[PDB]
């Protein structure tokens, strides 16, 4: 809705930024994805603290990868450590597509949105992490 949806300028920490670049890089052309742990303050500030990743596949991002089981499983670990984090959004890497969101990537983003209203979608370019511009 135009009356409550505003963009989320993401403050990305060292732990998230490095994690995402490395994970995509090794998998190539197998694409990796995951949920992002962080905290949400303001009506627009998201700090991305840390990430864990979902199943890689040789077709890359798909509906099959996204299951509530992985997420639910993680949350139980979050309690046990005594970490508080709610889910800020999700990430993926596209070596096999550009920054444009692929047809399977939108499907995957819609599911993740149902769980956290404020959801962000990130393209990582693992390939570019080899060169000095990322």
């Amino acid at each position: 809705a135009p009356a409550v949806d505003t963009a989320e300028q993401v403050y990305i920490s060292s732990l998230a930024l490095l994690k995402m670049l490395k994970h995509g890089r090794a998998g190539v052309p197998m694409e990796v994805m995951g949920l992002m742990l962080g905290e949400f303050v303001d009506d627009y500030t998201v700090r991305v603290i840390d990430v864990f990743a979902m199943p890689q596949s040789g077709t890359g991002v798909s509906v099959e990868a996204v299951d509530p089981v992985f997420q639910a499983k993680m949350l139980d670990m979050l309690k046990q450590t005594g970490r508080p984090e709610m889910v800020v959004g999700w990430y993926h890497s596209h070596p096999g597509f550009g920054c444009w969101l692929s047809g399977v990537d939108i499907n995957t983003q819609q599911s993740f949105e149902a769980l956290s209203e404020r959801a962000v979608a990130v393209v990582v370019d693992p390939i570019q992490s080899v060169k000095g511009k990322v």
């Binding site: 692929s102 047809g103 399977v104 939108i106």
Partner: protein, 396 residues
């Protein structure tokens, strides 16, 4: 006219230059070709971009191999010329994916989305078959005996194989067409094709021989197979003196090219399986200038006679040609026919037409008897003479 031509030359040059600028500049001026009915289609089009099944890549199934472990394996050749093995279609029948059949396979997943209409396996055979018209008996001179045999041999077994069973023989695998040229053989051939409702595929022998021999071999085999798919067909090989010439191979001449193409055709004539009710029709000057080796007489069947029109014989063609045409005459068909010497049918047919061209000269619009009389005298001399090589010394 030297001074006058320069003036005109300069004036065009200037006007022509200015034109270049105007044309380029105007263009279509940022318009859209689709207009209003495609707007709804744009929204669809976007959904397809997201989709993985679109775009499909056309390919063809080359070979059937089973070592099945999912659903039936086929090896297809992609048009980037990488071979890939794909599997049975996502929902469509296995009976639609065949050897030498075209298939649409996904660009991103490479599995058969849908099969497509068959054949694109040769490049060359597809090129060699050309357009087909129909001309009828009216237009082709004579109701003679020579004309009558063409019908009886070609039309009857293909139209009704029943007649040919009754007699106790098979419908011809082969059929031979012979007679010297300039008699309307091709014309007659077109005319029986319509009646029979038997598709005729015209073929040229000159395309078959090529610099490196082997292309013509694969072409001929592929060509028989295509025809075999068609039911009650004729493969009409026109103007062949490759598959049509002398039996001999020099062994450093273009004669090598002829001999490979002939040799596969012999294999095809017998077949990998026989060819009951399939006719190949071949045109030669006469059967004595055709191979005794490619001619293995049981298979070829009847040899259909066409011969050079006689003086009586040309009297007959000329009534057909004249009657078909719109002409106003006083003089008769027989006189003018006797007027002609024994030469070819073709001079005598041209008389009927030339009388119409003399009418435009004469400043009429339709022919008259005097135009007719003028046409015989010029035509007999013109076409016959001022032609042919002036040597038949030192040839093989």
């Amino acid at each position: 006219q030297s001074t006058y031509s320069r003036q005109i030359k300069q004036v065009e040059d200037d006007i022509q230059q200015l034109l270049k600028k105007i044309n380029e500049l105007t263009g279509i001026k940022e318009s859209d070709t689709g207009l209003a009915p495609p707007a709804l289609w744009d929204l669809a089009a976007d959904k397809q971009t997201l989709q993985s099944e679109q775009p499909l890549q056309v390919a063809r199934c080359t070979k059937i191999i089973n070592a099945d472990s999912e659903d039936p394996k086929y090896i297809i050749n992609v048009k980037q010329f990488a071979k890939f093995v794909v599997d049975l279609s996502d929902q469509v029948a296995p009976t639609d994916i065949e050897e030498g059949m075209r298939v649409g396979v996904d660009r991103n997943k490479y599995q058969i989305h849908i099969p497509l209409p068959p054949k694109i396996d040769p490049t060359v055979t597809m090129m060699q078959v050309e357009e087909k018209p129909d001309v009828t008996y009216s237009d082709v001179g004579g109701c003679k005996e020579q004309i009558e045999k063409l019908r009886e041999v070609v039309e009857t077994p293909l139209l009704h194989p029943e007649r040919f069973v009754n007699l106790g023989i098979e419908p011809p695998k082969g059929v031979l067409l012979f007679g010297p040229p300039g008699t309307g053989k091709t014309l007659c051939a077109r005319a029986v094709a319509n009646r029979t409702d038997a598709c005729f595929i015209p073929v040229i022998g000159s395309e078959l021989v090529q610099k490196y021999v082997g292309e013509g071999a694969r072409m001929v085999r592929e060509l028989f197979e295509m025809a075999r798919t068609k039911k009650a067909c004729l493969i009409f090989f026109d103007e062949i003196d490759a598959i049509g010439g002398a039996r001999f191979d020099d062994g450093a001449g273009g004669d090598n090219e002829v001999q490979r193409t002939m040799l596969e055709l012999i294999n095809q004539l017998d077949g990998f399986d026989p060819r009951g009710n399939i006719k190949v029709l071949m045109a030669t000057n006469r059967p004595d200038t055709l191979d005794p080796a490619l001619m293995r007489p049981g298979r070829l069947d009847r040899k259909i006679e066409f011969s050079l029109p006689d003086l009586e014989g040309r009297t007959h063609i000329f009534k057909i040609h004249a009657r078909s045409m719109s002409v106003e005459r006083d003089i008769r068909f027989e006189l003018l026919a006797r007027l002609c010497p024994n030469s070819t049918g073709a001079e005598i047919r041209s008389v009927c037409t030339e009388a119409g061209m003399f009418a435009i000269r004469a400043r009429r619009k339709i022919a008259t008897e005097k135009d007719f009389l003028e046409a015989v005298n010029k035509v007999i001399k013109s076409y016959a003479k001022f032609s042919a090589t002036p040597r038949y010394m030192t040839y093989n």
